[PDB]
């Protein structure tokens, strides 16, 4: 342990405590290695994550992810995240890039963990991007501190994940569109941040809320930037009756054969939409894996198609 003697649980006032989540002194051998560790919640009952503080090496940490899950992919001290992250759904809670904004939780908003439904584990992913072979051993203890409370929060945060699966990229087609769309049928969620995931053929990912045929932008981004959470300037209310619809733009230029949307020889079109909902009607995760309203896309705004290099 990098000499740090901070302690894995720190009590705060009565109902709160901080959870130092830190790599157990690891040593990366190639630039672009993703290391993973897990931390169990110390409480069995329900708690609320209400804040984070990055503790990343200035000199080499590129990216950090924190997820919430019940079954991490390993039980050893640490592992290579290529192996997996969680065996079950890895529910993303926090993201950090060097020089990207970190996006703070709004006041009164907490992620729900523990209890019957809540994630039992945190898994931390630290991407090292920039390494010298003279570092010998080094020993890095990068991670994050997390502020938890058992004071029930009034708004609860969650992740609405949009995923594409029925789309293929014929090689050399300059522009290929992957569209996603599901009906919204829960209580109101209010969208306040978003992240976009795609492999290297992705050009731009956009996400919208369509209400009575009018599209409101949730967020838009080139997915080859640092894949952190970008804040929504004004949070978008999404409501029973509305449709959520995204739109991944790919290229097949330079490619030999058809690329699919399913490993790193595939592609992916993921849009991670981070929301809050009033506590009594809330849920921590939702997913769309379909395109139920494909014809609607002929009327999608023109900004959805314009590149962001």
Author numbering: 46 to 307, 309 to 355
Sentences reproduced from the published study:
Two enzymes, peptidylglycine α-hydroxylating monooxygenase (PHM; EC 1.14.17.3) and peptidyl-α-hydroxyglycine α-amidating lyase (PAL; EC 4.3.2.5) working sequentially are the only proteins known to catalyze this reaction. PHM, a two Cu enzyme, catalyzes the stereospecific hydroxylation of the glycine Cα of peptidylglycine substrates. The two copper atoms in PHM, CuH, and CuM (located in the N- and C-subdomains, respectively), each use a single reducing equivalent from ascorbate to catalyze the reduction of molecular oxygen for the hydroxylation of the Cα of glycine at the carboxy-terminus of the peptide substrate. Crystallographic data on apo wild-type PHM and on several crystal forms of three CuH mutants (H107A, H108A, and H172A) presented here show that the copper ions are required not only for the catalytic steps but also for substrate binding and for locking the overall conformation of PHM in a configuration that is catalytically active.
To determine whether copper at both sites is required to bind peptide substrate, crystals of apo-PHM were both soaked and co-crystallized in mother liquor containing N-Ac-di-I-YG. This peptide binds to wild-type holo-PHM in both the oxidized and the reduced forms. In contrast, the structure of apo-PHM determined with data collected from the N-Ac-di-I-YG soaked or co-crystallized crystals showed no additional density corresponding to the bound peptide, indicating that copper at both sites is required not only for the later steps of the catalysis but also for binding substrate.
